[PDB]
Structures are given as C-alpha cells and as structure tokens.
C-alpha cells in the first residue's frame, strides 16, 4: 500500500534524502511529510494522518501504536546576531544567555528537549522566521546546522554554543515506527541500510 513518513525541519537534507532513497528501495509507495518537531510528534499522534514512520528529534517514550529507535544524530547551534549584546562576553553560558530573549519554536504543549531556556521568550512557527528575527537582533536561538551554515560562514550570524558543546549540540535523531511495521522485513531492511549510510555520511 502506501507508507507515509514524516521528517522534521531539523533533519538535514542529506539525511532526508538518504532515508527516502532507502525506503523506495525497500518499500513500494513512499509519501514524505515535513513538520517542525513539536508538530512532528503531535502530528503523528493525531491518528488522522496515517503516518507510519516519523524521523524527528523530539522525545516521547510511550506513544500509542508507535515504537522508538535511534537512526543517528544531527547537530544544532545557538546562533545570534554578531552585534547582539551577548556576543561581547566571549565566554557565553546557559546562565549568561537566560537573561536575553530566545526566539524559540512552539506550535500548545512543549517537550523537554524543545523547552525554552529563558523566562523571556518569543515563539515562532518555522526556522526561517526565527532566523529573520535573530538576524535583526530580536533575540537568540537554537537552529540546525544545515539552516545556519551559510549565515555563519558569511559572518551574518555567530555562535554561542562553543563552550557548551564545541562543534555543535549533538542531538539524537529518532525513528518512531508504527508497531505493525515491526513485522515487515522491509522495515528492518530499510533500518539496516539507512543506519549504515547515515553513519557513512558522518565521515
Ligand atoms: F532543531 C534543533 F536545532 F536540532 C534543536 C535542538 C535542540 N536540542 C535540545 C536543546 C535545547 N536547548 C539547548 C541548549 C544547549 C546549549 C545552550 C548554550 C548556552 C548556549 C543553550 C541551549 S540544547 C532543541 C531545539 N532544536
């Protein structure tokens, strides 16, 4: 039949392409859906979408009709305008940043992972709007690598996360599979080949 797969906006495009490619190799019919991780898990939970597989970074252990696995990792950066107040410290820390405002994603309840670090916050609905605001000094934010690679190699934006996690904040990328699919050798073959290829990318 059709299998439907969700991937969030934090999943780098090489990642999304690698997954899709393997699925079409080991599945007949593949429909791809994209949402922000908060709406990633909410969306699969709605049950009206008939999402069979979801690849996101948001964590929830007991979900109905869905099991969990780790598919790999992605990296994320705390970014902010170079002339944002914060940049002048040179040694920025989660306490030093809790005073200044965070553009954060939120689309009503919130997960722990995507919980805001600050009392002064502003919710945005996608990453492009987050970064437009950040680039206007409105606040600071947590964005994926693939999104801000260019604005950081261009000096447009800066990084404050090189004390917390040098190199980027290594987040897990989870695969939330529908329970039934566990019994299809196809799902397992997808899983094997994907996990391998993604690690091969990591080099
Ligand atoms: F889409 C992703 F870009 F992948 C993503 C990843 C993500 N990880 C959980 C975290 C939340 N706050 C963190 C943090 C870690 C270090 C700092 C230091 C002070 C600068 C601040 C906040 S890490 C959350 C949202 N979005």
Curated annotation (Swiss-Prot):
Keyword Cell membrane applies: yes
GO process annotations (BP): regulation of DNA-templated transcription; regulation of transmembrane transport
Alphabetical keyword list: Cell inner membrane, Cell membrane, DNA-binding, Membrane, Secreted, Transcription, Transcription regulation, Virulence
GO MF: DNA binding; DNA-binding transcription factor activity
Regulation: Both 3,4-dihydroxy-2-heptylquinoline (PQS) and its precursor 4-hydroxy-2-heptylquinoline (HHQ) function as ligands and promote MvfR DNA-binding activity leading to transcriptional activation.
Record carries keyword Amino-acid biosynthesis: no
A single Gene Ontology CC term: extracellular region
Locations listed in the record: Cell inner membrane; Secreted
Role, per record: Transcription regulator that plays a critical role in virulence by positively regulating the expression of multiple quorum sensing (QS)-regulated virulence factors, genes involved in protein secretion, translation, response to oxidative stress and the phnAB operon. At the stationary phase, negatively autoregulates its function through cleavage and translocation to the extracellular space.
Family: Belongs to the LysR transcriptional regulatory family.
Subunit-level organization: Forms homooligomers.
This protein's name: Multiple virulence factor regulator MvfR
Biological source species: Pseudomonas aeruginosa (strain ATCC 15692 / DSM 22644 / CIP 104116 / JCM 14847 / LMG 12228 / 1C / PRS 101 / PAO1)
Shown part of the complete sequence: 93 to 297 of 332
